[PDB]
Amino acid sequence: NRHPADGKKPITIFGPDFPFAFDDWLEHPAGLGSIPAARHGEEVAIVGAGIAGLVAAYELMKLGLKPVVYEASKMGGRLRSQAFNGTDGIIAELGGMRFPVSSTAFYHYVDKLGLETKPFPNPLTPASRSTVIDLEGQTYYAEKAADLPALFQEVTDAWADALESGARFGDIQQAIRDRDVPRLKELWNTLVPLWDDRTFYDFVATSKAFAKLSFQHREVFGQVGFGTGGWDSDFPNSMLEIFRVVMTNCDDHQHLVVGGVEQVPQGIWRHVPERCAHWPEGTSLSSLHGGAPRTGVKRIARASDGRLAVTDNWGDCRHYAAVLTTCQSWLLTTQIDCEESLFSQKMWMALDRTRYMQSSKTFVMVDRPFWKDKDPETGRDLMSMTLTDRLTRGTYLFDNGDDKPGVICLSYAWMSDALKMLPHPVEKRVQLALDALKKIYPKTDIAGHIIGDPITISWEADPHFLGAFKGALPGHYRYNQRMYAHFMQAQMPVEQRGIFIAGDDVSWTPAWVEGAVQTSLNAVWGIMNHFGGKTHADNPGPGDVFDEIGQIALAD
Amino acid sequence: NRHPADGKKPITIFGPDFPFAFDDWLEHPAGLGSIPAARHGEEVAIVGAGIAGLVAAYELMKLGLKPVVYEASKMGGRLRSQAFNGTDGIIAELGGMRFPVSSTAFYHYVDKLGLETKPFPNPLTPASRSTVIDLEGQTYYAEKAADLPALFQEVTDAWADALESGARFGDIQQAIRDRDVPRLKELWNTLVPLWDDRTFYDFVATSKAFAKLSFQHREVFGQVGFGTGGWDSDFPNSMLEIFRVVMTNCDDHQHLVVGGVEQVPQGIWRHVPERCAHWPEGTSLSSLHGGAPRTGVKRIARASDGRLAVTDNWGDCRHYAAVLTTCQSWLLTTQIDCEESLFSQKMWMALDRTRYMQSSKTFVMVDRPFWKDKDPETGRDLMSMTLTDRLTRGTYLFDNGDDKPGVICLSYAWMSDALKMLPHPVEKRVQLALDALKKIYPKTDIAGHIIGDPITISWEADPHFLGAFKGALPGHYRYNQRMYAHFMQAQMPVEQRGIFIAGDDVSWTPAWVEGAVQTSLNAVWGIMNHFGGKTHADNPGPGDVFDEIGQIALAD
Ligand SMILES: Cc1cc2nc3c(=O)[nH]c(=O)nc-3n(C[C@H](O)[C@H](O)[C@H](O)COP(=O)(O)OP(=O)(O)OC[C@H]3O[C@@H](n4cnc5c(N)ncnc54)[C@H](O)[C@@H]3O)c2cc1C
Ligand SMILES: Cc1cc2nc3c(=O)[nH]c(=O)nc-3n(C[C@H](O)[C@H](O)[C@H](O)COP(=O)(O)OP(=O)(O)OC[C@H]3O[C@@H](n4cnc5c(N)ncnc54)[C@H](O)[C@@H]3O)c2cc1C
Ligand SMILES: N[C@@H](CCCC[NH3+])C(=O)O
Ligand SMILES: N[C@@H](CCCC[NH3+])C(=O)O
Ligand SMILES: N[C@@H](CCCC[NH3+])C(=O)O
Ligand SMILES: N[C@@H](CCCC[NH3+])C(=O)O
């Protein structure tokens, strides 16, 4: 139980758009349901061996199907843990790195695997010893929030007030705690039509609290943020997306997975459940595949026999009664030739109009966590978690024990600040970061502690992603609602049935692994239903309650 | 005279933020002023040989200085015309392509060089024979606006009414026509605090006209636009930016330069004025350089003698009393080591927070303008200017005469639609565009007419730009105001004087060539002033009236 020890019922990612108890579904001893025995052993294609792909595969295998996973690049997708030269257990998190404990469906799989987690070192948490804020050449050091000048407290207070006055934050959170669905939906559904079409930035600037403060206060709020770095990158996003972040504590109480979160997908791959339908004891996704996913998918089409024909990179064509796609949504045009008649024209527009955000990270390894040392004159740590308006933006320090090498994320950038780095090689990104940090820390010799190889990523640049994660712009609620409900196919024409989607791009909470796991499980219900299956009476699943508690539809 | 023949005083790009008559300044027989003879021949460095750099060089040469232009990549910057294999006069416009005749300072140079222009083929203009709109698989063909279904006219009506009700469009345009400065500033200054912090989308959705229409109406408005393609890409931008586009007719009455707009910067380079101060007859920028700009700049610092030290790619270091930089703003951090004390901390923030937009274009050549042929059954053109929600977005047809080859821009994309193409090679971009067009035109064999080589660009990818052009996000008014005014140095500390900036990123109107020219001319005044010069009493210039009619400052 990683929840904060505050004596309350815990905040979880429980809707608010679809407040279904994924955790309870997953933990119930009846299982996720059954498929008729005569269909046991039939294949279902799953494009993408990211977390959504492998979650859907694992559970469908448990239901007595043979998932067939395809993966065009690397195992784990945006959960990716690259090992530094010559080390064991020392990694850089290139995608997902800090996992809110509200992510109960994600953590089900973490615990099923027996993996260890620890608090992530976000600013001003017990996990981080100190934080340095550097803005317009003015540098502030703090071991607790009270060490900061008054403006920073004025900003936090205004933010908390805008959420309470503007969104009924307190009431929503209590309903989440209690899992009081009618109440949560009443409270949430009111916000949906009021904020789809307005931005994060608009919410802030027009709120009472910020409107009476200087421009500089909301500016500073953009650059330094509310617990997890500056979110000026997301000022443009629809406010509903942000409401979702804060209401479900995605931005608080976060852990990193010891040894790398890539152990989650790699472990699901290899995991042998005690009880599968159909399959013999000792069966895993890996044993069913003979060890690897298939190669990348090049084409999806409807075959004359009514099945879906999937052709790989090397022209191998295989037929399936159903196909789940988990690649980011653009790839169904840019990377796969997906026959158009497989989605409605309304669906294509959702898939095609979804915006993906940009992200950069640059990492080095260091011989020891030297930042813990004290400057004798000042009493400060030699280095801190760094928030700045310089090009690095966010710098994060990873302590692996005094007797092991440290890891430093030199820069974690979003959007514009990511785009600055796009065409530059690793050596240049490192240099620029180190020069930026030398300005903030003139006395600290970081370069002198650096060992191993540097590691960078730009998710935008990779043709298998075309972005770090979705970001909902204002007015995209309708596209999301279509994509999120696509697993409910009882009213679709026959020509559109049997193909499914999932991923954090399908979810209402992109950039958060829980969104990939929950939509993945919705698709599991959908695929089960497609094979003539159904949930157990004592353990109803997504599609059994979707029509009553799913996301509101808006007007045409 | 390329202005519309409507018998009115023409709309020009006259403010509204700084309603200075650049064209009058330029055309006045007295010239732009003078610099004391004792400083004739001294050097001023100019970073970048795009339009802002070459304009500033040209005029400073005329004032008796020796500009020294640096260029790290290609001549002309974002005015780029690439010639297709084996051809003469047949180009693709990779940057700037359609130049609003309201751009009177830009067209001063076009006409000084004697270049020929013709109306650009935008949808439903005399320059275009027909337009095809393709949305959610429904295709509409039109030779005049009246051929379109009713919804499209409801959209245009609502857009025009939102501008009239919401922005006093009529009154502002009249004040622009009359060059009534007090009135224009009154009418504009009211809008500045009201729309800095709000998006284009918010302007549209909350306007009376669109709020009573369906979502689908503003959705279609995003995909199809108001004369120059769909601008859903800019829905996130501050509304002040859009107001500036429409109020100054940037989006109407556009011409292309025959033979390519790159002839403008290449012609300025080579142009020999009748009278320069100091320089002998026959002097050009080219003759003054020996033919070529210097190579790229790697560093700018304050030398111990007070001058500015500029070090090129090859380590050659040269000293200057002044330096103009015209590269896009990020490059003063990514591409040049620009000493931090050379700009104020408020300026660095403007420079570093500015957002750059993405843009893609894919072009092919064809043996003849076969699109003009008629399908005998339908009476339609074989192909039209195409607006679509497919990945191409906008397709443009260039007729060079029946006896010459045609040029087709298969796709001109912004933002997300640009990002789709980022990592893909030209061949892939062409194929995707042709497969999208096949769907819209199943009977037209475009591929069969294609000849020559394909041409693509992604401005985001190029380390000498890092974007196509700035796009002001809500709340960016203050950063633009800082950048726009930086050429006024009378109250700066000494350590910050002598460096200047210019470019369409400095301007209020990014993505428009007139913004680069006007800011370039402000920099001209600033540099003249820096060398102890002044304008002629009968021809006052930017910095002589800036304190009285320049851009309003906003509160802290
Ligand atoms: C920089 C960054 C930081 C993040 N930080 C956090 C965080 O701190 N906390 C958090 O909770 N979440 C975080 N996330 C989000 C998290 O990583 C995602 O929600 C999740 O990993 C996405 O999972 P997915 O299954 O939806 O898709 P993916 O991980 O994208 O998996 C999809 C797979 O499809 C593959 N594919 C593509 N094309 C084809 C093809 N033609 N054929 C076959 N396969 C193909 C891809 O290679 C990929 O492996 C972060 C993401 C990024 C990018
Ligand atoms: C896709 C696109 C479409 C456009 N369409 C239109 C249009 O339709 N109508 C219109 O009016 N305008 C349009 N524009 C805008 C127009 O192209 C610009 O406003 C203008 O040409 C930019 O001039 P500039 O001098 O500001 O900068 P740039 O043209 O970027 O010039 C800066 C120069 O400096 C160089 N440089 C960079 N780093 C260094 C270094 N370290 N040292 C030396 N030099 C360096 C660059 O290589 C470049 O040559 C468009 C722009 C784009 C990208
Ligand atoms: N341009 C620098 C910052 C200089 C100003 C810092 N206050 C950067 O992005 O890192
Ligand atoms: N969940 C990620 C991304 C947050 C920004 C969302 N656009 C993080 O905590 O870093
Ligand atoms: N995915 C296709 C569009 C299919 C739907 C078109 N109405 C594209 O981006 O071009
Ligand atoms: N001048 C460019 C403007 C692009 C939109 C600017 N955000 C064009 O006409 O195509």
PDB file of C-alpha atoms and ligand atoms in Angstrom, chain A residues 333 340 345 348 352, chain B residues 136-137 389-391, ligand 5:
ATOM      1  CA  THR A 333      -2.080   6.668 -41.541  1.00  0.00           C
ATOM      2  CA  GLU A 340     -10.318   3.383 -44.622  1.00  0.00           C
ATOM      3  CA  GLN A 345     -15.461   8.995 -40.972  1.00  0.00           C
ATOM      4  CA  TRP A 348     -10.958   8.960 -38.593  1.00  0.00           C
ATOM      5  CA  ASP A 352      -6.326  12.336 -37.362  1.00  0.00           C
TER       6      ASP A 352
ATOM      7  CA  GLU B 136     -15.249  13.144 -43.739  1.00  0.00           C
ATOM      8  CA  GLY B 137     -15.460  11.521 -47.119  1.00  0.00           C
ATOM      9  CA  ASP B 389      -9.215  16.870 -43.590  1.00  0.00           C
ATOM     10  CA  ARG B 390      -6.950  14.253 -45.130  1.00  0.00           C
ATOM     11  CA  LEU B 391      -3.172  14.505 -44.392  1.00  0.00           C
TER      12      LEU B 391
HETATM   13  N1  LIG C   5      -6.251   9.045 -42.151  1.00  0.00           N
HETATM   14  C1  LIG C   5      -6.471   9.726 -43.467  1.00  0.00           C
HETATM   15  C2  LIG C   5      -7.885  10.284 -43.573  1.00  0.00           C
HETATM   16  C3  LIG C   5      -9.020   9.275 -43.559  1.00  0.00           C
HETATM   17  C4  LIG C   5     -10.332   9.999 -43.373  1.00  0.00           C
HETATM   18  C5  LIG C   5     -10.626  11.004 -44.366  1.00  0.00           C
HETATM   19  N2  LIG C   5     -12.032  11.576 -44.328  1.00  0.00           N
HETATM   20  C6  LIG C   5      -5.561  10.918 -43.654  1.00  0.00           C
HETATM   21  O1  LIG C   5      -5.001  11.489 -42.728  1.00  0.00           O
HETATM   22  O2  LIG C   5      -5.436  11.400 -44.755  1.00  0.00           O
END
